[PDB]
Amino acid sequence: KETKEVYEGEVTELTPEDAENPLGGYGKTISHVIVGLKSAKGTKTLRLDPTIYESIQREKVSIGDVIYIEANTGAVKRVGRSDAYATEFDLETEEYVPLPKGEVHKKKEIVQDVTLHDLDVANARPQGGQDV
Amino acid sequence: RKETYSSYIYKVLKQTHPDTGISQKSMSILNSFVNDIFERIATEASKLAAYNKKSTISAREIQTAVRLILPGELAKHAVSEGTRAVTKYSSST
């Protein structure tokens, strides 16, 4: 029985801010990213770490997309474009999804089936973090 | 136009218990309670200032009135809270 901390909602604001010396050699280009998430009967704002923002921008999210952030590993899933805007003006065969129910911040319990060999090969070849 | 303390004590309850409701009669008891406590403390302070032939009420006579009225561990916690509040307010520099 596995418990997941989940942030989810519709992206409404995606605003980064810059570092003082981007060519300083050490430290990334940006310092924080402000993300505005809206779900059903709720709305939250988050100040993202840059390491989370690498996985956010690797999924190629934008303003008007419904996302799904898993706080256990930092993995981000881009669900699809929101249906609150228009539909028939796209050319990339995307999937249109309503707003997620409930609050933005959630905790849910998930029952998983896992063999010991799966844990062995997960720890032997580590894929699933956000590191190099 | 009438005066009550209700929003302040409501906020005090939401700081420690967010999911708790309120009877209006409970506000009537607790408003009477805070007014009665203010009543005894203020006339104890005025009585003590009239004792010392002073025409001024400051923090020290109400400190002595709090020491007189409240029981000892409540007295020490109350003067701790009051001293930290008045030293925070006095740092307007």
Binding site: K4, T45, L46, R47, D49, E70, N72, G74, G128, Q130 | -
Partner: protein, 297 residues
């Protein structure tokens, strides 16, 4: 302008006899225009524009007041719905005195429902009536219903019943209907049950009922055809149904027959996170990447 005029004349003759009438035709022929013609004909007969209680379910309350306003706008309308202050000002409105009949009155036609006949029995115990019609009285069939109990306490001395299908045959529904129609004559259910079983039952209620069937008019109503569609069981529905059979629990059987996700909802398919991280043991919120491994060297 149709054959319900003969039925209303029959009901007026039964009212002139002195007994409470029976109408149990199924809906689809418009008994509402029949009832407003009954009210108009009695108002043309003995010159009464007075108060008229009618019990009606709340789904068709607005439809009935709409058809009253559209059909015959001579009478006055005083509905009953809303909040208790609106109920108080309607209690201010209907304050009649000296009984009988009034010409300049605002309480000519008023509405109600069963749910506030039940809950406002103290205010409605007084003010004896002259006409109460129980429109769509299919829900009266329980003998222990308090709505039937404070419907029995009215001093109206009229019990004209409107319903579609009274043939639920629970053996106390028919005695309850006969007790509501004639209160003095029908008071014992044991003598009703004690006093061939098919022909006599037709002749029990023969002078009261009138035989009208939908298949007498021009059938442009549609002539409904029953198309029964059968489906098989999917393997998720098969698994939940064999689990429910292994437990044998009826509502669970229905709610897994229609759709599997009424019992449990399918959730996100994610890999099992073999991490230890910063979790909450509960103008923005800060989140930082903090996943580590449980294995420490």
């Amino acid at each position: 302008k149709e054959y319900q005029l003969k039925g209303l004349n029959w009901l007026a003759n039964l009212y002139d006899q002195g007994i409470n009438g029976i109408l149990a035709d199924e809906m689809g022929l418009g008994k509402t225009v029949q009832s407003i013609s009954v009210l108009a004909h009695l108002a043309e007969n003995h010159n009464i524009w007075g108060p008229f209680l009618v019990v009606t379910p709340a789904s068709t309350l607005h439809n009935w007041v709409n058809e009253i306003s559209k059909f015959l706008p001579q009478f006055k309308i005083l509905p009953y719905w809303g909040n208790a202050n609106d109920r108080k000002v309607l209690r201010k409105f209907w304050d009649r005195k000296n009984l009988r009949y009034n010409k300049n009155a605002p309480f000519h036609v008023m509405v109600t429902s069963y749910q506030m006949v039940v809950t406002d029995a103290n205010y409605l115990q007084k003010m004896k009536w002259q006409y109460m019609i129980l429109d769509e009285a299919q829900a009266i069939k329980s003998s222990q219903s308090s709505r039937w109990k404070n419907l029995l306490s009215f001093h109206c001395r009229n019990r004209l019943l409107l319903t579609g299908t009274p043939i639920q045959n629970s053996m106390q529904e028919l005695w309850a209907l006969l007790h509501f129609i004639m209160p003095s004559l029908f008071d014992s259910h044991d003598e009703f049950n004690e006093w061939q079983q098919l022909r006599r039952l037709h002749m029990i209620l023969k002078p009261f009922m009138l035989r009208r069937v939908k298949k007498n008019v021009q059938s442009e109503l549609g002539d409904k055809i029953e198309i029964d569609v059968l489906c098989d069981l999917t393997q998720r529905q098969a698994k939940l149904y064999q689990v429910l059979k292994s437990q044998i629990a009826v509502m669970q059987f229905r709610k897994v027959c229609n759709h599997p996700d009424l019992f449990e909802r399918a959730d996100v398919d994610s890999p099992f996170s073999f991490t230890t991280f910063g979790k909450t043991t509960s103008k923005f919120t800060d989140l930082i990447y903090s996943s580590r491994n449980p294995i420490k060297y």
